[PDB]
Structure formats: structure tokens, C-alpha cells
Amino acid sequence: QTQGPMSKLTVVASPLAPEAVGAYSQAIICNGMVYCSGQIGLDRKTGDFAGKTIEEQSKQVMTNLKYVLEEAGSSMDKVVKTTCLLADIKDFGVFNGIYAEAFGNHKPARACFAAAALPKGALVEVECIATL
């Protein structure tokens, strides 16, 4: 329900996902679609990476994405398309296992690649578009 003179773009700010400090928001909702920033494997509780391994960072990324999606009114089952960026193509298999477990039976469209490097030395970054 409306709370006085709702806008075309809505900022999503989950207190469970890493804080968007800086020139970006965790996600923006526009015309019923949720446009999510590329999450990295930071744990909001410590402000640091969940660990130094692709396994630990990948699990934290997928958890962070869930937090943002649920905050927006969306969910993992409503994700339309993801893009999955790795610091090292050799880590793609371990990533894929964790990604598949996080989505269960739901299978978004996807594009993946190894970047030359990611912000903050992250080993993995995942962004997505979802629906309400």
C-alpha cells in the first residue's frame, strides 16, 4: 500500500546484504522488474570476504543475492537472467556446483566469463535481473 504522495524507480536496501556505500544501490526496481548489482562474497556482519576460497565466496554471493531479491519482493525462483564473473576460469566448476544448489530446480538464463580482475580482489561476482 501507498504511504502518501511510490515512485518509478525504487531503491532496494537489505540490511542483511553488504551495505551499498558509494555511488550505487543493491538493486533498483523498475516497471515490475528487479535489476540487481553484482554481488561479491562480502559478509555484512564482518564487512569482509566470507573467506579466501572460491567455495566460501560463492556461497556468500548466492546468499547475498537471495537477501537482495527477497528484500525487493522477489525471490531466487523469480530470477530471469544472471551474469557470473570469475577471477579465475579454473574456479568455474566449483562455482557452478554452488550456483546450482542455490537455485535448486529454477534455471535462469545465464552468461559467464573470467574477468581479468574483480573489485576488491573478489574471486566471484554475480548480478541478475529478476521479476516481482
Added chain:
Amino acid sequence: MGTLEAQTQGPGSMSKLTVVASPLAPEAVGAYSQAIICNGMVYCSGQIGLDRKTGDFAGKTIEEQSKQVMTNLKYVLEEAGSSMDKVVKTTCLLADIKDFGVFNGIYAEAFGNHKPARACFAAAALPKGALVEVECIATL
């Protein structure tokens, strides 16, 4: 379950998110779909130069893989009810930036006179050893 001849086929045959599954494009075996349709738009996965008929790459060269990528995109789009002419935006990823020129020629030939918005870059490496990967959004 799915629609046939652009008509519903029972509760379950139509839903907010529709999985696109062309038997002509590489099979999506793992945790992704070739494309997802949502609110009249088709969100396509990054195609790589695999030939569904063999389960393997169309060839070892940038020319053969780029042609296969474009053809695969066409199969997925047309399966969804879209087409190359309805592509809105692509992202073109290369394993070697020096391949930009040859890739561009094949990409342009596939789109004819249609000109999607585009972003291009060379990745450090692509899934499955691909030389080229192209994803896109299109409209129905």
C-alpha cells in the same frame, strides 16, 4: 507444458517466466536455460559455438565458432517467438581482442541491416574454451 500455436494448453502451460528450449540450439543441461521470456522480452544466455548435432564446437577457429554462435542465437530467438530483427541489445565476449574485426564481420552479416545496441570486450577466458560468446535481450 507449454503454449501451442500461440494459445494456452491448460493451467500450467503459461506462466510469468517461460523457459525457451530449442532442439536446434545446444541443449541446456546444467543449471541454466537457453533463454527466459518475461513480460514480452526474451533474455538469452550467452551462446558459444557448439553444434547441437555433434555436442561439440563447430570448429577450432574464430570464424567457425562465430558463425555457429550467431546461428545458435537465431535458433533460440525464433524458438521463443522472436527473431534477429527483434534483438535489442547484445554483449559480445571474445577470448582474444585481436579477433574483434573478424568477429564483427560475421556478427554484422548475421544481423543484416539490423543494429542492436552492443557492448564488447575480451574476457580473460570463456566457458568451455570458447573463443567467442554472445548474449542478448530481444523483444517478442
Added chain:
Amino acid sequence: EAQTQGPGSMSKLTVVASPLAPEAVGAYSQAIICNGMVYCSGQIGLDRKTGDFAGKTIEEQSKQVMTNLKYVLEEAGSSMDKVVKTTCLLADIKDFGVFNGIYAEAFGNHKPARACFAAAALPKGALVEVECIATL
């Protein structure tokens, strides 16, 4: 405010062609509008006024990229304040801090969703490329 100008003047897809941003001389358009959303190509730091990069540095190219994006968006009928999501690509991750200062300056108080990474390389040896989706 805008009105149709005869059958064929308006279509499902609209090409955005700002004369102030670098001309799209290849098989692409600066942006495409579809169903009230504007899908912008990756801008690199070319200056329309010269036809060359604004400068050799990350500072000059980042400022020019943000300006180019603003020109495409305003041509389309959108604006920096209506940007929903950007993807920011760098030739070198060490340039992230300088790029980010210029990006934040350009957006002011508006905070789109964002993904960033360094590529192995960008077209024409560009140091920075930024694409986006925005609403009308």
C-alpha cells in the same frame, strides 16, 4: 509532448542517434528503446568533437564516457537520474578508484544498480567502457 509523424515513423524498437555522442559507425546503435526502457551500448571515451579519445588517461576517458552516456540518454528521452543499472568495464582494475570518483560525480545523488570488472582488453584499446539500462 512528442507525436507520431506518419505510419513507419514510430515502431516497437526506436534507434537512439545523438549527434553529440560518438557516431555509431559499425553494426550497432548507440541505444535501442523498447517498451519504455532504453538499452544503451557500451560507451568508450571518444569525443565526437575530435573523433579520437578525449585523452590517453583514465581521467580524461572516464569523464568523456559519462558525458557520452548522458548525451545518449537525453536524446532517448531519458536522463542520468533515470538510469536503473550500469555495467562498468575497465582495462585495469587499479583504475577503479579514479573511475569511481568520476562516475559518482556524474550521477550526483542518483545511485543505479551496478556491476564492475576489469576486462582483458576493450575495443580500440579503451581504458574504460560503460553500458546501461534506463527508463523513459
